[PDB]
Scaffold this active site. Sequence first.
Site, PDB file in Angstrom:
ATOM      1  N   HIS A  98      18.485  43.456  82.527  1.00  0.00           N
ATOM      2  CA  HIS A  98      18.530  42.238  81.836  1.00  0.00           C
ATOM      3  C   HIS A  98      16.734  42.153  81.887  1.00  0.00           C
ATOM      4  CE1 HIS A  98      18.121  41.088  85.922  1.00  0.00           C
ATOM      5  NE2 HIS A  98      17.199  39.562  85.762  1.00  0.00           N
ATOM      6  N   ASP A 154      23.781  46.757  85.569  1.00  0.00           N
ATOM      7  CA  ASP A 154      22.365  46.282  85.724  1.00  0.00           C
ATOM      8  C   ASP A 154      21.361  46.745  86.532  1.00  0.00           C
ATOM      9  OD1 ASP A 154      20.094  43.587  84.777  1.00  0.00           O
ATOM     10  OD2 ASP A 154      20.600  43.173  85.944  1.00  0.00           O
ATOM     11  N   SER A 189      18.929  42.034  90.440  1.00  0.00           N
ATOM     12  CA  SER A 189      19.913  41.298  89.699  1.00  0.00           C
ATOM     13  C   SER A 189      19.923  39.869  89.834  1.00  0.00           C
ATOM     14  CB  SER A 189      21.187  41.976  89.764  1.00  0.00           C
ATOM     15  OG  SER A 189      22.211  41.209  88.310  1.00  0.00           O
ATOM     16  N   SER A 203      13.030  39.675  89.588  1.00  0.00           N
ATOM     17  CA  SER A 203      14.180  40.570  88.866  1.00  0.00           C
ATOM     18  C   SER A 203      13.829  42.243  89.270  1.00  0.00           C
ATOM     19  CB  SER A 203      14.535  39.962  87.964  1.00  0.00           C
ATOM     20  OG  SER A 203      15.525  39.320  87.213  1.00  0.00           O
ATOM     21  N   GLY A 263      11.379  36.173  88.977  1.00  0.00           N
ATOM     22  CA  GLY A 263      10.041  36.953  88.769  1.00  0.00           C
ATOM     23  C   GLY A 263      10.436  38.443  89.650  1.00  0.00           C
TER      24      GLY A 263
END
Lengths: 185, 51
Positions: free
Chosen positions: A33, A63, A156, A141, A139
Site C-alpha cells: 500500500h 500487501d 499492513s 506501515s 507511519g
Amino acid sequence: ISGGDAIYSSTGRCSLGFNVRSGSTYYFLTAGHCTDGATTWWANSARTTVLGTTSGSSFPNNDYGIVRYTNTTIPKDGTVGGQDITSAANATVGMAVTRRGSTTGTHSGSVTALNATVNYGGGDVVYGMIRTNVCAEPGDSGGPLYSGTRAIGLTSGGSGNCSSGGTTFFQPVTEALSAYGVSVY
Amino acid sequence: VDCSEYPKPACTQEYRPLCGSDNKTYGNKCNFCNAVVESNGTLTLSHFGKC
C-alpha cells in the site's frame, strides 16, 4: 538505513521493512500500500537523500512492495534497528514477535491468528494475514515484524493504538521473498 | 475528506497527516474518519497537514 527506519515517497511516510538482495542487487521490502503509485523513495522528509525506485508492488490482495536501491553510498544494514536478521520463518500461533516502525519505535506481542482477511474498504481487501496483539500507528506501515533474528512479516494495518493497545495484521515476509526472488541477509 | 463509509475495522498505517478540530494530528484519513465516527460526528477537519 535499516529495518524500521522512515521512508518517504511523494505521498507520505512509511517504514522500511527489511533489506534484501538478489545477486549483487540491493532492494528493500515495504508494504504494497506504500509502493502503490510511488515511484521514488527518499531517506528524509526534505527528500534530499534518494534511496531508490519502486520495482514491484502488490496490493490489495497481498500487501508487499519492493524498491530497488539506486543510492550507492548509504549503508544498507541487514538488521532491524540494531538487531541482526539472519533468516526468514513462518509465523505460528503463540509466537512471540516484535515490530519496529518509524512512528512508534519497537513494540512486542504475540501471533494470535493466521490467514486472516482484513477489509480496508473500497474493494481493498487483503488475505492471508498474520494477526497479532501488537499495536501500530500511522507511519509504521511496512516496518518489520521479527522474532529473535527471524524475519516474519511486514506491517499492513489494523486498529487501536499504542496507548490503549490494539491489533495489527502483517503480510508474511516469506511470500514476498519468494515472489521477488530475493533473500534477507 | 468524506467519512461516509466509516467506521472501518481497520486502517492501513501510512502517514499523511490531517489536523482535527480537537487540535490533534490524525495520521491518515482512515484514522481520522474512525475518530469522527467515534465522536458521533462532533470532530471535524481543521486543515490538511499536522496541527
